[PDB]
Design a protein around this nucleic acid. Structure first.
Lengths: 716, 249, 735, 94
RNA sequence: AGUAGAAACAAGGCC
RNA sequence: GGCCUGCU
C-alpha cells in the first residue's frame, strides 16, 4: 500500500507525515493505512489553505500563484503539520490575541473573516455521521466544522461554507482521484476500516551480549549464571541459616566489654626530642609597640606615613649587629635587609606624599631571604631518568619534638588584661525589643571583659597582617612589597593610639593552588633577650638595634631593644583563615553565654549581672602548685578566647586528630564520672590513635599535657 | 524583526548552523549547561581573593555603552576583554556603585508588588508589638511546620501551571486549570503584573515561592503558626521566651 | 598559676562544653600533591581484607577479580569482607517480614520514576569522570560529550529523550567492535571493545581536602557517565525503601535525626522495667566502604525486586554488575625531585605498571609491587568492595536490616537491641536483664555484623549506660546539646556575591539561633563581626570614614549625593540596620522606605548589565559545602539588585589544548539565548520534543509576526519581510 | 506531468488492419459499449494475442499499436495510458 | 633557607 | 627585552 504514497504525493507531505508518524512512537511497517489516511487529511488541509489570500478587506483574494508583493497574506493558516507543542502554542497564541475560546482538541486551520478555527476531517464513512461524531467529541464548540467524504458530498452546520465553491469542486475531484486510483490498486478490503485505536506497548530492557557475561561473573562463588542465581533467590526462604553459621563461627570473634574504672586510664605519653620551637607568624608575648597617639580609626589612615611617624617617636637608634644567629641562614643578609628597610623608609619620608603602598628593590639579600629562583625547574621524565639522585619528594613522619615550658607561659600571658581596648565594634540597628536590650547588655559586659585582653590584640594583629598580605599578593604578584605591622587601640583616658610592631616584606606570590606558598620576611621590635630561651627561636635571627627608656622607680632601666627577623611563609588558605580570627570571639562568648543561659534556666531570671559583678561563682581554669585555681566568669571568657586564638594560630592536622581522639576519651571519662558504667572494646587502640597525633606542634603537645593534668585531677 | 535577524546571522556561519540543525529541542538543557567552568569548592576564599583584583566581576557587553570607561580621576570602570566562555566583559566593582549614583533611573514602584513575600514580612514586623521576656526552661520539641506564610494551598507542580499561565500564557500546552482557586489567582496576578518588566524568570520564581507550600522540620516550643515560625529565632530561645504578636493579628 | 581550659570540664560536664573541643577556627588540613599513594593503599587494603576469597579473570576485561562471598568464616576480630549470601538473604527476608509490602511498593514507585525519568536529570550532578577526555568534567559537559560520541557511532536511541533509552544505548555500546573518540592537541582515535569496556567501568580517584577530624588524608572516587543512570535508579529505590524504615537516618536531615534518636532511646529505656538493664554503644564502623561487596548489593536488589517485571529487575541489576567489575584510575601520578641537578619531574600514574621501582621509597615501592598484578591498562581492578560511599542508601538498608534482626522475635533470648544506623556510624541501645545478657547481646550483634561484611571499630567505639551517647557529632546527654562549633566556618562571607553574601550570612545567623541554640548577645556579636568582614572584603565601608580603598571615592560621592543616607545598602557604604528582630528580612526590603527614589531606581533597574539569571534552579540557591558533611544547597532570600552580579570565571583554559571548548560554550550560549528569546519559557520549564531548533524558531517567527500584526507594532511590509526571511533561512538550512 | 495524444482510430472492415499511436509502463486499453474497460497491450490480452502488436520508441515517447485480423468484437473506444494518466480515447469500429 | 607534612610550594606554559 | 594565565 505504501507504493501509493511513494508514487502520488509530493515529498513535503510525505516527510511531514513521517515526522507525525514518529511523533506518537508507533512503527509504519505494521499499519500503513493510517499513514495514507492522515496524509490525505494533511493534503486536503494544504490544498484548502493555500491559493487563498486576503488583503486589507475581507473577501479573500484568490490567486493561482502568489505574485511578488507584500500582499501574500494567507486566508487560512494551518494548525496541523506541526508538533503537539507547537500546535498548542499556536492555539494559545490565537486565543490570547483573538480573544476567542480555547478548544480542547487540535484544530486544523484559522480564518480571519469569521475569526475562528476549522477542523477538517475527510473520513471514509459518509459525512452526516462523522460530523456529529467529532462534534460530540468536542464540547460546546464555536469553531465551525466541515468534512467531506469520498462519495463527493459536503455538509456543515449553519449551512456555512466559508470560501469559493470551485475550491470545493477541486477538493472532491482530488477525492475521487484518490478513490478511483485505489480502484486500480484495490485497497477497500481494509481501507474503510483499518484503524481501531490501538495504544499499547511493553517496555523491554534486555541484558544480552557482553553485558550478560559480566552479569555471569558478578555472582557468589558457586553460581554459574544470573538466571540460576535469580531462580535460587526467588526460591530462597529463611530456614535458620544465621544461627547455624553463628554456632559454627569461632568464639574468638567477640566484642567483650572491658570495664572502665578510675585506675584504668593511663596518662598520655608525650614524644621526646629537641624542644619545641615557635611557629607563629608574629611575636605574641614579646611584642613591642611604638605609638603616636593619633585620632585615626583602625582602617583610617595611610600605613607608611603612620609607621614612619611612630618610628620617629623613638630615639636611641644604634648601628645594628648580630646577637643571635639564625643557625641555618645568612644573618648578614638579615642585617642588610633591615638597613635597607630603614634607608627606603627615609627615602619615602623625603619625597612629596607618602605612597599608599611601596615596592622595594630586589637585591640579592631579599632574593635569598624570600627564596627566589629556588624552585627546581620543571622538566620531562624522558630527559631525566639516568640521574641517580632523582627520587620522590621527602615523605615521612615529621621530626619529633618534646614540649617546652614557653608555650605555657605564652598562653598564661595571652589571657591577661591590658591597658587598652583592642576591639572597636561596628553599629547595629537600635534595639527595639526587651530581649534585644538584654542581648545588648550581655554583649557590652563581654566586650568590657575581653577588649582589654592580649587575645584580642593578637586577633587584630593577625587579621590586619593577613589581610594586607593577601591583598598585596593578589595585587603586586611580582614585586616585593613593604607593609608595616599596624594596630590601633584606645587608651584608658579615651585617646586613640596607633602601634607599630614592625614590618613585613612580601615576596613573589604567584599563588595558583590553595596550598601554594608565598614567602615573606618579618621584622619585629622587642625587649625580650633571646639568650634565655634560645630553643624557642630556632628559626629566628635576632639583632640589637637600639635602647629604650621606660619610666620606672629604679632610676630608669635603659633596656636593650632587639629586632626579631625571620623568613616565614603562608598560603591562600592560611591567609583567608587567619583573616577570620574574629570568630574566636564568637566561639568563646557563645560558650560563656550558653553557660549563663543554662544556669539561668534553673533560676527563673537573667543571671548575667551578678555573674559579672558579684564574682561569687568560679570555675576551675588552671592549676597552681598549691592546687586547682578557680577564676570568675570573666577569666573563663578570656581563657576560652585565648584557647580559640591559639587554635587559629597553631592550626594543623595534628590538632584536629588529637582533638577528635581526645574528645572521645573525654566523653568516656565523663561517663565514668557520671556513674554510667562505661565500657570499652579496645582502649589501647584509642590510646594509640591519640598518641600518633602528637609529633612536634607546641599547641597540641600543650593540649595533651593539659589533658594529662585533667585526668590526674579527675578520677577521684 | 531583530530576533529572526540574529537567527539568520547565526545560520550564516557554518558551525552555528550545524549546532542549530542537528541539536534537538530536548537536548536544549544539556548544551545550555555545557560549560568548562567547574563549580567552586571554596567560594569564600576566592571571593576574598578575586575582589583584590581589578575587574573582578562580569557584566553584559551593553555596559560598554552606558558607563564610561573611566571615572573622574581615571579609575577604570570596565574592560573590553570578554569572559572565558561568554560574550560578557569583566568590569570593576566601581561600575556597580557608579550605576547607583549616575546610572539610568526607572520607576521601582512595582517591585513591592513583585516581591510580595519580603514586603509582607516587613509590613508584618513593622506593626508587631513586643512583650516582657520570661526566663524559664523551654521544652523545645521537634515538629514539622510550614515556613511559608503566604502559601495558597498549592504544591510545586500544582502551582507551576498557574505560574506559566500567569507569565507564559502561550507555552501552557494542554493544561487548562480546572480549580477555581487557581482561576482567581491567575486573574489577580495577571491584572496586577500586566506590564511589570523585571524579568519573566524572576516573576515566575517569586510566584512559585509565594503560592507553593513548603514545609520543614524545626525545634519549636509553642507557636506552630506560619506567622509565628518566621520569627521563631526572636520569640523562642534556650532559657527565655519573648512574647510577640505580628502586625497581621 | 598556669591557665588550663581543659580543667573547666571538672565543673561543667563534657557535653555541656563540648564546643571547646572543636578547633574549627583554624585552617583545615589540605592535601598538596598526588592522591595516587592513597588510591593504591586503599586498593591493596580492600584486596587484603578479602585475601581468602577466590581469584578469577574476567573474560571481557581480562582483569583479575577476587570474590570473597561465601568464603571462610572469620576467626579473628580484624576487618573481613567475607559476607555470606544466605545470611544476608535471610536478613532481607526478615526485614520484609517485619515490614510487609515494603519491597513491592518501593519497586512500584521506582518503576514509575524509571519509566518516566528524563535524560536531563543526569545534568543535575557535580563533577563526573568523562571518558572521552579521561578527566573529571561537569556532569552536563560529560553527558553532552558522551551523547555526541554515541550519535557519531550510530547509537541514537537517546534521541527519544528518555534515561531508560540512554541506558539501552549505553549497554548496546558494550557490544560494539570499534568506537571512535575525538582528541585535541582534532584527531579521531579508535577504541576497541576491551579498551572501551575498561573506560566505561573505570573510576577517577582524587584526594579529599577540607576534611576535619583526622591526621591522615583519604582518597575519594568519581564514576563515569555510563553508570550514573543505573546508580540514580538504584539510589531512588533505596531512598524509597529507607523512607519506610524508622531505623534509618540517612535520607533525613539533622533535626529529624535528633528526633528519631530521642524517640528510640525513650522507647528502649522506658519500655525496659526495673529488672532490665540498658546500655548504649556509640559505634563507628572501621573500613565501612572497603568491606561492602557489590555482589552482595546485587543479591539484595534481586531479592527486593522479586515478582516484578523482568526489565525492571535487569535495569536495577545492571549497576551492581558494573560495580563488581569496576576499575579505579590510580590518580594524578607522582612527582620526583633531584636536588643534585636541581630539577623536578611529574610522571603520570599510568606508568606505574612498567616504571622501575628505584625512584620510590620503601612504602610506595611495596604498595606498587602489591598492586601491580591488578593493573590493567593503567587502572587497577577493585572488584572486592565499594570505593567511597556510592551506595550509601543500600549500605544503610543493610545496617537497618541488622538493627531490626534483634527485635526480640529473632533473638530468641531475654536480651534484645535496637538503635539507629547512618552509614559508617550507629547508636545501638541494647537491653538485657543482667550484665551477662548485655554482653551476650552485644557479642551476637557483632558476630552477625561480621557475617554481613560489616565491621565495628573497637578503637572508636564505647558502651555506657543509656542517657549519654554520640551520633554524627550530635552529643545526647538526657537531651541533645547544641555545639555551634560545627557551623562556625559558615559565619563568614559565603563568596557568591554582595547581596547573596549578606542574605546568606543573616540567614545563617538566624538558623543557628533557631537550631544550634545560639545566644542573643552572641548572635549580635556575630552580626557585628560579619558586617565588619563583609565591608572589609567588598571594599564597601560606611562612607563617612576616611578609609581609602579602590572603591572609597565613588562610595563617598554617592554618600554625599544621597539625602536620606539611612537607606543606603551596606554594599554601597550605608549604615547597618540589622538586629535580632531583622535577621529574616532582606536588606533591600528593610531599607526600602528609607531609600531616595533616584538611588532606589538606579539600584533596582531591570536593564542593569550586571544581573544575570540562567535557570529557575540557580535563581536564589547557593551551594555551601558544610564543614564535616556533604555538599548542601540553601535557599537564600534576596532581591535582584545591581549587586547580584556573578564573579569572574577561571580563564586558565586559554593556555590549554582544550581551548576550543570555550568557542563551543559561546556558540551554545548564543543559540540558547536566541531560543529563549524565541521560547521565553525555556528557562523555567525545560522544553521537550523531538524537533530541531531552527524548525521551532522559524515556525514561531511565522506565527508571532502574523499575530503581532493582527494587533501590534508589526506592519504588512515587516510581516512579509519576516515571512520571506523565514523562507530564506529555510532554503539556507536546505543547503 | 505527462499529456497523452492518441491517433489512427476509425472504421475498418472484418479481417482488416488498423494502426493506433499515442504520443506522450505505457499501454492501450479499450472499452466497448456496456462493458468494463479492459487491457489490450502494455510495454497482451488473450483475445488479441498473435493479432495485435504493440511497440515503444523511448526517443520520441511514442507507443504504436498495430491491430491485424480485426473482428466486430474489437469495436470499442481505445485509450492510451501512462503510469495513471489517460488519453481522451479514439473510436475503433469494425 | 623557609612554609608544610605521608606530597607538595618555593610561578607555569607558549615563542 | 617584548606579550599570555592564575580553580582547567
Amino acid at each position: 500500500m505504501e507504493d501509493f504514497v511513494r508514487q502520488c504525493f509530493n515529498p513535503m507531505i510525505v516527510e511531514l507525515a513521517e515526522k507525525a508518524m514518529k511523533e506518537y512512537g508507533e512503527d509504519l511497517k505494521i499499519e500503513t493505512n493510517k499513514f495514507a489516511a492522515i496524509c490525505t487529511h494533511l493534503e486536503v488541509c494544504f490544498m484548502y489553505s493555500d491559493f487563498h489570500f486576503i488583503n486589507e478587506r475581507g473577501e479573500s483574494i484568490i490567486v493561482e500563484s502568489g505574485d511578488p508583493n507584500a500582499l501574500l497574506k494567507h486566508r487560512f493558516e494551518i494548525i496541523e503539520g506541526r508538533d503537539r507543542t507547537m500546535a498548542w502554542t499556536v492555539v494559545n497564541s490565537i486565543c490570547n490575541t483573538t480573544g476567542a475560546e480555547k478548544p480542547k482538541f487540535l484544530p486544523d486551520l484559522y480564518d480571519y473573516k469569521e475569526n475562528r478555527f476549522i477542523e477538517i476531517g475527510v473520513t471514509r464513512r459518509e459525512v452526516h455521521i462523522y460530523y456529529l461524531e467529532k462534534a460530540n467529541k468536542i464540547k460546546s464548540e464555536k469553531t465551525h466544522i466541515h468534512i467531506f467524504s469520498f462519495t463527493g458530498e459536503e455538509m456543515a452546520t449553519k449551512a456555512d461554507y466559508t470560501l469559493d465553491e470551485e475550491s470545493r469542486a477541486r477538493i472532491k475531484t482530488r477525492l475521487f482521484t484518490i478513490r478511483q486510483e485505489m480502484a486500480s490498486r484495490g485497497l477497500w478490503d481494509s481501507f474503510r476500516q483499518s484503524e481501531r485505536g490501538e495504544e499499547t506497548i511493553e517496555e523491554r530492557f534486555e541484558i544480552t551480549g557482553t553485558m550478560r557475561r559480566l552479569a555471569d561473573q558478578s555472582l557468589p562463588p558457586n553460581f554459574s549464571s544470573l538466571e540460576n542465581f535469580r531462580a535460587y533467590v526467588d526460591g530462597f526462604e529463611p530456614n535458620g541459616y544465621i544461627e547455624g553459621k553463628l554456632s559454627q563461627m569461632s568464639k574468638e570473634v567477640n566484642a567483650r566489654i572491658e570495664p572502665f574504672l578510675k585506675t584504668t586510664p593511663r596518662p598520655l605519653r608525650l614524644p621526646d626530642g629537641p624542644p619545641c620551637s615557635q611557629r607563629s607568624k608574629f611575636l605574641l608575648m614579646d611584642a613591642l609597640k611604638l605609638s603616636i597617639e593619633d585620632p585615626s580609626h583602625e582602617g583610617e589612615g595611610i600605613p607608611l606615613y603612620d609607621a614612619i611617624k611612630c618610628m620617629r617617636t623613638f630615639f636611641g637608634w644604634k648601628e645594628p649587629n648580630v646577637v643571635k644567629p639564625h643557625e641555618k641562614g645568612i644573618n648578614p643578609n638579615y642585617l642588610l635587609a633591615w638597613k635597607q628597610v630603614l634607608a627606603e623608609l627615609q627615602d619615602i619620608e623625603n619625597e612629596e606624599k607618602i605612597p599608599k603602598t611601596k615596592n622595594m628593590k630586589k637585591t640579592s639579600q631579599l632574593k635569598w631571604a624570600l627564596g627566589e629562583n629556588m624552585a627546581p625547574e620543571k622538566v620531562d621524565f624522558d630527559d631525566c631518568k639516568d640521574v641517580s639522585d632523582l627520587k620522590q619528594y621527602d615523605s615521612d613522619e615529621p621530626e619529633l619534638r618534646s614540649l617546652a615550658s614557653w608555650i605555657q607561659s605564652e598562653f598564661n600571658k595571652a589571657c591577661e588584661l591590658t591597658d587598652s581596648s583592642w576591639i572597636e565594634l561596628d553599629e547595629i540597628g537600635e534595639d527595639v525589643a526587651p530581649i534585644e536590650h538584654i542581648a545588648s547588655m550581655r554583649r557590652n559586659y563581654f566586650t568590657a571583659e575581653v577588649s582589654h585582653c592580649r587575645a584580642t590584640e593578637y586577633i587584630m594583629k593577625g587579621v590586619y597582617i593577613n589581610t594586607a598580605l593577601l591583598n598585596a599578593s593578589c595585587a603586586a604578584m611580582d614585586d616585593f612589597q613593604l607593609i608595616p605591622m599596624i594596630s590601633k587601640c584606645r587608651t584608658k583616658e579615651g585617646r586613640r593610639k596607633t602601634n607599630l610592631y614592625g614590618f613585613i616584606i612580601k615576596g613573589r606570590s604567584h599563588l595558583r593552588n590553595d596550598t601554594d606558598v608565598v614567602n615573606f620576611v618579618s621584622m619585629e621590635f622587642s625587649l625580650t633577650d633571646p639568650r634565655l630561651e634560645p630553643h624557642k627561636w630556632e628559626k629566628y635571627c635576632v639583632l640589637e638595634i637600639g635602647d629604650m627608656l621606660l619610666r620606672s622607680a629604679i632610676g630608669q632601666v635603659s633596656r636593650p631593644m632587639f629586632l626579631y627577623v625571620r623568613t616565614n611563609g603562608t598560603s591562600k588558605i592560611k591567609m583567608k583563615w587567619g583573616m577570620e580570627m574574629r570568630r574566636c570571639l564568637l566561639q568563646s562568648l557563645q560558650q560563656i553565654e550558653s553557660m549563663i543561659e543554662a544556669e539561668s534556666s534553673v533560676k527563673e531570671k537573667d543571671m548575667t549581672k551578678e555573674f559579672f559583678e558579684n564574682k561569687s561563682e568560679t570555675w576551675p581554669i588552671g592549676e597552681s602548685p598549691k592546687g586547682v585555681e578557680e577564676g570568675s566568669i570573666g577569666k573563663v571568657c578570656r581563657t576560652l578566647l585565648a584557647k580559640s586564638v591559639f587554635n587559629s594560630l597553631y592550626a594543623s592536622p595534628q590538632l584536629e586528630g588529637f582533638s577528635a581522639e581526645s574528645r572521645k576519651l573525654l566523653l568516656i571519662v565523663q561517663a565514668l564520672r557520671d556513674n554510667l558504667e562505661p565500657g570499652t572494646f579496645d582502649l589501647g587502640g584509642l590510646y594509640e590513635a591519640i598518641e600518633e597525633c602528637l609529633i612536634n606542634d607546641p599547641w597540641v603537645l600543650l593540649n595533651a599535657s593539659w589533658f594529662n593534668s585533667f585526668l590526674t585531677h579527675a578520677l577521684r | 524583526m531583530e530576533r529572526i535577524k540574529e537567527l539568520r546571522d547565526l545560520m550564516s556561519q557554518s558551525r552555528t548552523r550545524e549546532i542549530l540543525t542537528k541539536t534537538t529541542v530536548d537536548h536544549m538543557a544539556i548544551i545550555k549547561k555545557y560549560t568548562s567552568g567547574r563549580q567552586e569548592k571554596n567560594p569564600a576564599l576566592r571571593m576574598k581573593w578575586m575582589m583584590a583584583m581589578k575587574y573582578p566581576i562580569t557584566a553584559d557587553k551593553r555596559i560598554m555603552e552606558m558607563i564610561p570607561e573611566r571615572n573622574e580621576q581615571g579609575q577604570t570602570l570596565w574592560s573590553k576583554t570578554n569572559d572565558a566562555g561568554s560574550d560578557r566583559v569583566m568590569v570593576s566593582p566601581l561600575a556597580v556603585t557608579w550605576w547607583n549614583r549616575n546610572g539610568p533611573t526607572t520607576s521601582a514602584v512595582h517591585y513591592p508588588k513583585i516581591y510580595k513575600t519580603y514586603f509582607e514580612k516587613v509590613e508584618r514586623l513593622k506593626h508587631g508589638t513586643f512583650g516582657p521576656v520570661h526566663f524559664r526552661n523551654q521544652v523545645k520539641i521537634r515538629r514539622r511546620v510550614d515556613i511559608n506564610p503566604g502559601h495558597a494551598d498549592l504544591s510545586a507542580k500544582e502551582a507551576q501551571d498557574v505560574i506559566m499561565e500567569v507569565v507564559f500564557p502561550n507555552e501552557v500546552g494542554a493544561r487548562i486549570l480546572t480549580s477555581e482557586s487557581q482561576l482567581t489567582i491567575t486573574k489577580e496576578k495577571k491584572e496586577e503584573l500586566q506590564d511589570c518588566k523585571i524579568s519573566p524568570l524572576m516573576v515566575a520564581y517569586m510566584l512559585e515561592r509565594e503560592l507553593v507550600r513548603k514545609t520543614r522540620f524545626l525545634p519549636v516550643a509553642g507557636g506552630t503558626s506560619s506567622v509565628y515560625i518566621e520569627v521563631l529565632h526572636l520569640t523562642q530561645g534556650t532559657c527565655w521566651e519573648q512574647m510577640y504578636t505580628p502586625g497581621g493579628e | 598559676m598556669d591557665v588550663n581550659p581543659t580543667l573547666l570540664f571538672l565543673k561543667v560536664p563534657a557535653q555541656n562544653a563540648i564546643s571547646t573541643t572543636f578547633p574549627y577556627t583554624g585552617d583545615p588540613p589540605y592535601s598538596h600533591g598526588t592522591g595516587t599513594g592513597y588510591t593504591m593503599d586503599t586498593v591493596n587494603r580492600t584486596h587484603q581484607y578479602s585475601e581468602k576469597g577466590r581469584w578469577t579473570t574476567n573474560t571481557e576485561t581480562g582483569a583479575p577479580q577476587l570474590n570473597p562471598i561465601d568464603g571462610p568464616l572469620p576467626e579473628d576480630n580484624e576487618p573481613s569482607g567475607y559476607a555470606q549470601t544466605d545470611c544476608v538473604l535471610e536478613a532481607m527476608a526478615f526485614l520484609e517480614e517485619s515490614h510487609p509490602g515494603i519491597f513491592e511498593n518501593s519497586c512500584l514507585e521506582t518503576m514509575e520514576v524509571v519509566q518516566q525519568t528524563r535524560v536531563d536529570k543526569l545534568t543535575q550532578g557535580r563533577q563526573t569522570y568523562d571518558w572521552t577526555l579521561n578527566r573529571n568534567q561537569p556532569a552536563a559537559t560529560a553527558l553532552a560529550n558522551t551523547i555526541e560520541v554515541f550519535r557519531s557511532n550510530g547509537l541514537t536511541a537517546n534521541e527519544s529523550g528518555r534515561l531508560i533509552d540512554f541506558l539501552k544505548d549505553v549497554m548496546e555500546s558494550m557490544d560494539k567492535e570499534e568506537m571512535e573518540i575525538t582528541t585535541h592537541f582534532k584527531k579521531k582515535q579508535r577504541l576497541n571493545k576491551r579498551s572501551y569496556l575498561i573506560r566505561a567501568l573505570t573510576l577517577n580517584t582524587m584526594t579529599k581536602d577540607a576534611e576535619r577530624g583526622k591526621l591522615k588524608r583519604r582518597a575519594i572516587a568519581t564514576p563515569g557517565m555510563q553508570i550514573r543512570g543505573f546508580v540514580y535508579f538504584v539510589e531512588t529505590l533505596a531512598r524509597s525503601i529507607c523512607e519506610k524504615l524508622e531505623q534509618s537516618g540517612l535520607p533525613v536531615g539533622g533535626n529529624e535525626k535528633k528526633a528519631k534518636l530521642a524517640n528510640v532511646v525513650r522507647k528502649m529505656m522506658t519500655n525496659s522495667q526495673d529488672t532490665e538493664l540498658s546500655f548504649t554503644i556509640t559505634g563507628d564502623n572501621t573500613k565501612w566502604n572497603e568491606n561492602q561487596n557489590p555482589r552482595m548489593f546485587l543479591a539484595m536488589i534481586t531479592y527486593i525486586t522479586r515478582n516484578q517485571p523482568e526489565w525492571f529487575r535487569n535495569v536495577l541489576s545492571i549497576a551492581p554488575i558494573m560495580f563488581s567489575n569496576k576499575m579505579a584510575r590510580l590518580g594524578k601520578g607522582y612527582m620526583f625531585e633531584s636536588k643534585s641537578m636541581k630539577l623536578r619531574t611529574q610522571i603520570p600514574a599510568e606508568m606505574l605498571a612498567s616504571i622501575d621501582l628505584k625512584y620510590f621509597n620503601d612504602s610506595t615501592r611495596k604498595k606498587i609491587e602489591k598492586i601491580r598484578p591488578l593493573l590493567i591498562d593503567g587502572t587497577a581492578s577493585l572488584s572486592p568492595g565499594m570505593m567511597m560511599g556510592m551506595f550509601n542508601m543500600l549500605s544503610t538498608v543493610l545496617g537497618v536490616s541488622i538493627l531490626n534482626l534483634g527485635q526480640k522475635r529473632y533473638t530468641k533470648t531475654t536480651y534484645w537491641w535496637d538503635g539507629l544506623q547512618s552509614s559508617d556510624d550507629f547508636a545501638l541501645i541494647v537491653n538485657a536483664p543482667n550484665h551477662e545478657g548485655i554482653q551476650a547481646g552485644v557479642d551476637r550483634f557483632y558476630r552477625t555484623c561480621k557475617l554481613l561484611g560489616i565491621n565495628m571499630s573497637k578503637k572508636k567505639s564505647y558502651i555506657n549506660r543509656t542517657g549519654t551517647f554520640e551520633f554524627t557529632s550530635f552529643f545526647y546527654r538526657y537531651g541533645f546539646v547544641a555545639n555551634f562549633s560545627m557551623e562556625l566556618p559558615s559565619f563568614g562571607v559565603s563568596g557568591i556575591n554582595e547581596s547573596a553574601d549578606m542574605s546568606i550570612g543573616v540567614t545563617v545567623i538566624k538558623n543557628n539561633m533557631i537550631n544550634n541554640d545560639l545566644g542573643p548577645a552572641t548572635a549580635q556579636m556575630a552580626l557585628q563581626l560579619f558586617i565588619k568582614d563583609y565591608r572589609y572584603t567588598y571594599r564597601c565601608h560606611r562612607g563617612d570614614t576616611q578609609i581609602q580603598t579602590r572603591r572609597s571615592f565613588e562610595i563617598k560621592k554617592l554618600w554625599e549625593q544621597t539625602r536620606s543616607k539611612a537607606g543606603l545598602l551596606v554594599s554601597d557604604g550605608g549604615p547597618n540596620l540589622y538586629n535580632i528582630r531583622n535577621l529574616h528580612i532582606p536588606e533591600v526590603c528593610l531599607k526600602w522606605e528609607l531609600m531616595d527614589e533616584d538611588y532606589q531606581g538606579r539600584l533596582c533597574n531591570p536593564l542593569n548589565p550586571f544581573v544575570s539569571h540562567k535557570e529557575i534552579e540557580s535563581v536564589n540557591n547557593a551551594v555551601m559545602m558544610p564543614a564535616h558533611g556533604p555538599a548542601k544547597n540553601m535557599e537564600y532570600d534576596a532581591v535582584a539588585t545591581t549587586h547580584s552580579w556573578i564573579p569572574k570565571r577561571n580563564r586558565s583554559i586559554l593556555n590549554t589544548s582544550q581551548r576550543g571548548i570555550l568557542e563551543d560554550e559561546q556558540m551554545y550560549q548564543k543559540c540558547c539565548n536566541l531560543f529563549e528569546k524565541f521560547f521565553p519559557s525555556s528557562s523555567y520549564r525545560r522544553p521537550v520534543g523531538i524537533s530541531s531548533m531552527v524548525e521551532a524558531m522559524v515556525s514561531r517567527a511565522r506565527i508571532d509576526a502574523r499575530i503581532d500584526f493582527e494587533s501590534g507594532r508589526i506592519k504588512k511590509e515587516e510581516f512579509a519581510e519576516i515571512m520571506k526571511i523565514c523562507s530564506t533561512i529555510e532554503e539556507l538550512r536546505r543547503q | 506531468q505527462v499529456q497523452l495524444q492518441e491517433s489512427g482510430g476509425g472504421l475498418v472492415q472484418p479481417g482488416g488492419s488498423l494502426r493506433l499511436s499515442c504520443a506522450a509502463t505505457m499501454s492501450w486499453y479499450r472499452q466497448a459499449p456496456g462493458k468494463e474497460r479492459e487491457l489490450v497491450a502494455s510495454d497482451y490480452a488473450a483475445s488479441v494475442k498473435g493479432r495485435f502488436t504493440i511497440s515503444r520508441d523511448n526517443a520520441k515517447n511514442t507507443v504504436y499499436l498495430q491491430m491485424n485480423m480485426l473482428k466486430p468484437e474489437d469495436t470499442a473506444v481505445y485509450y492510451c495510458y501512462v503510469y495513471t494518466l489517460f488519453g481522451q480515447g479514439t473510436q475503433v469500429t469494425v
